[PDB]
Amino acid sequence: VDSDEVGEQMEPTFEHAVMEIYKGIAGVDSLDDLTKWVLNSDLVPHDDRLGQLFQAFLPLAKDLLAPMARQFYDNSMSEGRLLTFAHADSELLNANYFGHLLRLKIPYITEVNLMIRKNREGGELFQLVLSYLYKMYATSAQPKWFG
Amino acid sequence: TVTSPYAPSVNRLMPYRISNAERQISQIIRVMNIGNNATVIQPVLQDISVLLQRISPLQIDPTIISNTMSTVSESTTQTLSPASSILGKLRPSNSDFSSFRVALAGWLYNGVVTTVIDDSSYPKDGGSVTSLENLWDFFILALALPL
Amino acid sequence: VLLQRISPLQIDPTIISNTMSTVSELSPASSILGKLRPSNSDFSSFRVALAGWLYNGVVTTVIDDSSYPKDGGSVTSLENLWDFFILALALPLTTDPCAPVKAFMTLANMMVGFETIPMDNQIYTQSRRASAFSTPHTWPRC
Amino acid sequence: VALLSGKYPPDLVTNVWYADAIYPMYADTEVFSNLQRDVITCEAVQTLV
Amino acid sequence: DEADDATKKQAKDTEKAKAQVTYSDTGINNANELSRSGNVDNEGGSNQK
Amino acid sequence: SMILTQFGPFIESISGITDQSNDVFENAAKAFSMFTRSDVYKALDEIPFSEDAMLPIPPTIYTKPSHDSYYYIDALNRVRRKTYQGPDDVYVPNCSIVELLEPHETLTSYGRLSEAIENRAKDGDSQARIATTYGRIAESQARQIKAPLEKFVLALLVAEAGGSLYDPVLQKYDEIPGLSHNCPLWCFREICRHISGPLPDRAPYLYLSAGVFWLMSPRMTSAIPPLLSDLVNLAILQQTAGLDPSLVRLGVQICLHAAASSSYAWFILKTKSIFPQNTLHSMYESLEGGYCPNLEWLEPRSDYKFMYMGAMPLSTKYARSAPSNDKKARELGEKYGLSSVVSELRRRTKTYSKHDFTSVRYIRDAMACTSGIFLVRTPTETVLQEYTQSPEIKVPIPQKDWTGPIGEIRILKDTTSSIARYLYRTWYLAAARMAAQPRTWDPLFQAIMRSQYVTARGGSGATLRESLYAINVSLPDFKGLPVKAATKIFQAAQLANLPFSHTSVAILADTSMGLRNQVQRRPRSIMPLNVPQQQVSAPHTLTADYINYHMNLSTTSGSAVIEKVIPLGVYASSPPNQSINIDISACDASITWDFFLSVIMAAIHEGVASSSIGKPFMGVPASIVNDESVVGVRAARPISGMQNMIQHLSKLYKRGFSYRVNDSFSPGNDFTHMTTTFPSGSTATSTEHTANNSTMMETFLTVWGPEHTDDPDVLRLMKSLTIQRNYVCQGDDGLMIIDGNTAGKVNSETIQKMLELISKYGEEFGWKYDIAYDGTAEYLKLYFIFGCRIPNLSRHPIVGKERANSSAEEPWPAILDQIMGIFFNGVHDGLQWQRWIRYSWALCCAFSRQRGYLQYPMWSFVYWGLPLVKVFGSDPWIFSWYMPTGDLGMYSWISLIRPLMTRWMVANGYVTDKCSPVFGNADYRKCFNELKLYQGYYMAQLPRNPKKSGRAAPREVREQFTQALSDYLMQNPELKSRVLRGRSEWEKYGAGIIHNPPSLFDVPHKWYQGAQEAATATREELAEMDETLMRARKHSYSSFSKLLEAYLLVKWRMCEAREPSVDLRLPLCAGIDPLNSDPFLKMVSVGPMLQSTRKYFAQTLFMAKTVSGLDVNAIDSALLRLRTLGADKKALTAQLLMVGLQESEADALAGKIMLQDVNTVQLARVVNLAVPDTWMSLDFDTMFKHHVKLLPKDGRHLNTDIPPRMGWLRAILRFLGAGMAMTATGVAVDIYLEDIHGGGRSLGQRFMTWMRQE
Amino acid sequence: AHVASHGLHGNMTLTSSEIQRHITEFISSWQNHPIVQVSADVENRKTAQ
Amino acid sequence: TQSLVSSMRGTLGKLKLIKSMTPMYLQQLAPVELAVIAPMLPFPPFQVP
RNA sequence: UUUAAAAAUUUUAAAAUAAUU
RNA sequence: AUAUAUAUAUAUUAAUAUAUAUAUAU
RNA sequence: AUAUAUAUAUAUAAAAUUAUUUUAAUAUAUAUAUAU
Ligand SMILES: O=c1ccn([C@@H]2O[C@H](COP(=O)(O)OP(=O)(O)OP(=O)(O)O)[C@@H](O)[C@H]2O)c(=O)[nH]1
Ligand SMILES: [Mg+2]
Ligand SMILES: [Mg+2]
């Protein structure tokens, strides 16, 4: 099961739902201005601005993604054993996931792939800020070596 | 410590200063409005009493008297217990310990209020030096009168 | 624990009961052991005090605050007499330098109202705690 | 019984105690308004006379 | 009001719920300070009309 | 007419007219038994109700839709409810019930679920499963009572037939309206009528042991059982509590609106706060006067010592200043159509402007009118609604504030910018100080903590077994044992000879499910953790305990509630002071790994490291693990046993828990569910919750408050508060006292702003504080306003009894305990004393006979505590309920009547030529046998539970079981060496003085029995109890107990009324006012409880701690038998060794035993005289000390003299004085010793022979 | 007390008469207490002034 | 009382001559054990006079 | 010369009733 | 005739669900 | 592949605080006294 499947099956999909998050900020007026207000002229965004953004990103993840996943993973469990991926253990914990929960990790710098790959929804900067938000929604625990 | 500003003012108008005659006259009037009643002056003493209790760092507990008395040795085969008699007659009736603060607040008013000790506190129609429970009454009155 | 596997001594508080159980008769024969005892502290504190002798440069064993007569002795009492006796026996085995002045001021506190002595100021009056002392600057001139 | 049994808290520092026990009663200003009443009382008495 | 607004803007600029460098409610007594409002004109009279 | 013609003598007897007697009692009980439900509803038909009880009933209550549209089926084959409004509508709906029933064979108008539907559902059909789930759940909702409602209604008619009563104190008949103004009875009768219709059978369903049979009528629904239970409760409360009939109407209206809605329990759950929100939380917007208590809290606040200092008058400045409760209350009232009721309450409340008895009675009446039903729903709905909640963590700990891993744990960097650092510091210091204590390193403490959780209650041993099976490890089964199967004793016996690395795989095993309903709250949930999971969670609970008891020290756990917790509310609600009520909503679901458990585990893993460097904890090895906390270094570092356990516990907490749900109400639901909610069955639960509560509040006030608020007022308010002087918490709930300064009550806007700061503080790390600031106290379900406790009568439903399963109830005589409990619950709530006593008389007959019959004489009920009325030709209503229960109570009520008691005997025949010292010449020995006094007095003392006999298991397997259990208990060589040395020393010295000296080898022989009696009783034991009761009834008795005989030699003298101990104008408990004469006089002349006087001779020789398997009785008797005979001290030391103590510790205990001469333990063991339950609220300590005088009134007598070496006798004398004084109605009086027949020395010798014979 | 001392103290039993006796004895003390004598809850015009 | 005074004096007199071996232990065997344990020890002694 | 203070310990392990988290 | 206590003696150990096998019918 | 009757076995429901009540023969026999 792809990692994006549980978020793609929504009328406004999840990433589209979070792209409209710049309205809650005090003033941004556009997604590019959001990516500029968050991290400065490299990655490692401003922690305070990232926190102000996370306080808005969180209710989208607790009230929409968790209820949708709680049904999607049940429907998937009904039709056989499947190997499912996710972006954070909190996704599989809040949505009450059954099975073995294996955290994992890769020996590379994953943040650079978010600039290498091109044809993704929203700018590459938005994909990267989204990855930061998932990493901030992560409930620190040992990822333990994908191999 | 209160603070006042130090700079060119704006010419306030705070009319709060009056002579001594204008104050003694009102004192005479409000003392004339209080003579002989005793239901007009009791609540003032009660209010000052509760204020004294709230401002004072003093506590009251009869456990001090209990522990002090418990160290004297009394015979088990007797008919009179000096330590056990004062402990009995040293518990106030209707369990009110207010009379202390009320007497302490009556010091501010001896021209219109005279705090006397109640007739019930005396030895009930003549004492007798041959009576232990009746000798503790003299002890209590002697300690309590000077206040 | 090393002193445990080594030492031949072994404590027997029944000696106290044997000695006290031959008095005919507030009862002095029922104060130290049967009453005034922590009930959970066995005698590891003893050999911890013994092991503290080797390390008076970094560690300074002192008598706990909770083993004093609780704000005044009042020698008229009996439990406080026993408390004084036990503190006076236990103090010499510690390693802090102010054990003697604490042993003196325990009785000085207990005998307030009966006997008086001149102190150094009005902060460390005779009615202080014996444990509030323990700096060499706080030993009374008297 | 009040005279015989008294006690202070073990952490009593007098200045620190009174510094915040006495503060809340000097933050209200009813005492200053109790003077204009006396002004008007004296004015009324003199006007009647 | 302007001191309060400056404190709030400072809190927003430093991205905190409460600004650390505050311009209002300092320890100083500044009850005589003024500013320029639209209440008074150039003659010194009020600006009701 | 009918009830009168049946039992006029009984009406006369219990109504204080005719002297009571056993014959009228048993005849009335006959009338109760031989009596039918049609007779009940006909008797209800005889009542000519007035217009006052009239009321418009909604007709929609009867025509209801079908159940099919309310349910559906999940993608996981789970039948679950379809919510129509909100995610709360998952309770039983209101639907028809007739189309699913098949006619019962005997009673052709009643029936249960058709077997066709059940079988078709068992085959696997959709509609059949849905219908059977609906039927079973409706039955379970209708089974939540303790007996058939018609029996309670009959008892009510019995009691009320007598009419009004005469007050011996107020000298007048009380004005309580008769049954013709009781609109609950009217609604009950009208609903039963309109449902029955033309059918002859009148009961709409008959409650039975197995299940309920529904009356087959088209006008039937599933809401009727709870509605009828509500109406019965309201009727009984109005008749025995004097509720005014103007608020019972509103209660009945709300119950009707509930029964007319979609679902009943859901409406009652959404509408549970209309009476409190409009009466208690809105009182006194305008004060004019009244008195409130003046308590003063003593200085070392942490110990909870108080002192009452009189009543201070109230004034206008103390009026209510909390924020208004108007807009929200009217919004709630409008959303559900209850706007007229809300407006009526909001109007009637604004007319009380004086803190008075009448206003507190108003609040009590307004709050007794809320329904007291046990809410019920399917288990698969509880598990799917509660366990899906997850924390809402708005400011998580940054990922760059965790070091590398050390096994399963990461450490907080010391330079963290978060707020979790204070949590980490608190738990770290607590763990270090806990582990530093040398007590936690002996085998005895290890063994005590091991045996703490080995109980006879389930622990889901199955999944443990089948998880150990998955790694090819065997386990004994012990085939043929009469012991229960699902018990932690069974698990422990299995897991004796197993290394930790084998059983450690069973730490990740799942847990079974438990359920339990409540009043006005969703059905509880439970999870029992197995033995390994309870073992590995030892450091967590130990550190939580150390925090609760030494470091933070702001809690009421471990303290007596009625001596320390009641006057806390009395102090925190008095007017100058104020109270804020803080609660954490969903506390279990808010404690997870991402904020709390990770920090706590790192803290407990680091703090223990210093003083446990290589040692094993409770049977856990000293494992190793590599760490990466330091950058650039990666080295394997040894750890301890207490750290190995934290490793395993962390790898359990990280994944969450998996619950195996299998409900017996829906066929086809046995799924498994996985949550992150913290369990509610762990040993460490209730302590860590309160530790976290206190820690977060203190870090609040010390750090987070001053760094986010700017106004000087809130800063000065948060700086003057500390958790140890202004905060009290226990588990979830909490309380924050705010003292009043000299200017009066603290300002309201500042307190509000602090409250919203607390609300913002909770959201950063998950918690959701439910804060309530409105001028009333709240703690552990105790309400207070202006220092007046207000009992919540809706929380104690008279008829309600809870049954979270489908198992049948315990057979009679098991219900008499519940009836006595009903009486006592009525006692503690201050009901009208005459009315409540009479109703309890009428109710203790209906539950007295049942099938070759066996009947209780009334004397048994008088022995259990129920106070008499008119026995022996005395005055009506002389005895109060404060008379204790048992021998003391019997002596108390006898000695007050003894002269008349004997002259009546002599006046009807009973005469003999034997001058008894007690009763003179009358022959009590014949009459009391005739009057059935001895019979009841000795039948009451017989147990009413089937004593589970051993079923004679095989010798081989039983020996193996007990041996493996003992091996589990004494696991390390040190305990075994201690006990073996003790046995050797005993056989050297103590051989002969005792034959079976107790040791740590008899613990398994008690665990084995405790596993036995957890099973079900057998018909043999039931018949045995029945025959034993019949035998004990059919003897001929010659005297009371020896203790009561010795008691009856002492006489007393009622001299003077003691001075008042509280003002007669100060309300201290709502409902206890001059209208309630006897409780008022007792309270005002004795005074409330504010002291600590526990343990009136609970002395014993064994002052140490051992395993929970052992008993204090055996060791105490052994030490007493070894100290009275005067053996060598080596015998005492050998006993204390083989009871599992260290050498030095055992010898210190021997010295203890040698001190404290044994004349006191012997009496304490021979006599059983304790303070009864009802005296807990009064000040009995000063009554013992000062107001029961052993020197009689006119001096010495030569009879009351007591020898110098018999001091224990003064104790029993003070007993008898206090009991005889408290039994009589009116005010408590000074009682003086009068005369002891025989003499002081003779009575002392009588007690001394008994003390010696041990 | 007259009628009670009439009645042969050894042969006393409970009675409404005894209840009334104790109640009157009890309420005399509360009536004669001085704070109870001089006290009130509601303010008068003069005290409010 | 004189009885209590005599009992206290007798208790002191007997406690003065209690038969304990801890003092002779401390002076004869304890220092030998400390000296025997001192060399074989992870953290050597650190003393001031 | 006779009398007398006597110990206020615990956290008491399990089974039933009631209150609560 | 019964019961209580005294000394001794003796024996003595204390509801829903599922699985398996038998039988009868299809 | 199934249905019914029978027999056997198995699984399931917790922790804590508070207060009250109960937990040294199992039985018989001889000699002693007493009560009914
Ligand atoms: O059925 C449970 C009820 C609670 N208690 C224990 O009390 C603690 C808290 O109990 P709860 O977590 O159930 O209270 P709550 O959140 O439902 O409060 P509200 O939202 O209704 O306001 C838990 O730790 C649990 O162990 C259990 O012993 N029994
Ligand atoms: Mg709740
Ligand atoms: Mg709760």
Coordinates of C-alpha atoms in Angstrom, one line a residue, chain A residues 44 47 51 54-55 58-59 62 70 74-75 77-78 90 92-94 96-101 103 135-136 138-142, chain F residues 74-76 78 387-388 390-396 399-400 402-405 407 410 593-594 654-655 672-676 760:
Chain A
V44 CA 16.2 24.4 8.7
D47 CA 11.3 27.0 14.6
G51 CA 5.4 26.0 15.3
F54 CA 2.1 23.2 13.0
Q55 CA -0.6 24.5 15.3
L58 CA -2.4 19.5 13.4
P59 CA -6.2 19.8 13.5
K62 CA -6.4 14.7 13.9
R70 CA -9.4 4.3 10.6
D74 CA -9.9 -1.7 8.2
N75 CA -11.0 -2.1 4.5
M77 CA -7.1 -5.6 6.5
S78 CA -10.3 -7.2 5.3
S90 CA 1.4 8.8 14.8
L92 CA -0.8 4.4 12.4
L93 CA -1.3 5.0 16.1
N94 CA -4.1 7.6 16.1
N96 CA -5.9 2.4 15.4
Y97 CA -3.8 0.3 13.1
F98 CA -3.6 -3.5 13.5
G99 CA -0.5 -5.4 12.7
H100 CA 3.3 -5.0 13.2
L101 CA 4.4 -1.4 13.5
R103 CA 9.5 2.1 12.2
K135 CA 8.6 14.9 11.1
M136 CA 7.3 17.2 13.8
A138 CA 6.5 11.9 14.9
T139 CA 6.5 10.9 18.6
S140 CA 10.3 10.4 18.9
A141 CA 11.3 6.7 18.8
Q142 CA 14.1 4.7 17.2
Chain F
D74 CA -19.1 -2.8 9.8
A75 CA -16.6 -3.8 7.2
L76 CA -15.1 -6.1 9.9
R78 CA -19.1 -6.1 13.5
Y387 CA -10.5 3.8 23.0
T388 CA -10.3 5.8 19.8
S390 CA -5.9 10.3 21.2
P391 CA -4.0 13.2 22.7
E392 CA -4.0 16.6 21.0
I393 CA -0.4 17.7 21.5
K394 CA 0.0 21.3 20.2
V395 CA 3.7 22.0 21.1
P396 CA 5.6 18.7 20.9
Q399 CA 13.3 16.1 17.9
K400 CA 16.7 17.8 18.5
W402 CA 16.6 13.8 22.5
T403 CA 20.0 12.1 22.7
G404 CA 20.8 8.9 20.9
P405 CA 19.2 5.6 22.0
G407 CA 18.4 0.4 24.3
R410 CA 16.3 8.4 24.6
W593 CA 4.6 7.9 24.8
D594 CA 5.1 11.2 22.9
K654 CA 5.8 2.3 22.7
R655 CA 3.5 0.1 20.7
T672 CA -9.1 -7.3 18.7
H673 CA -8.5 -3.6 19.1
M674 CA -5.3 -1.7 19.7
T675 CA -5.1 1.7 21.5
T676 CA -2.6 4.0 23.1
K760 CA -4.3 27.3 27.4

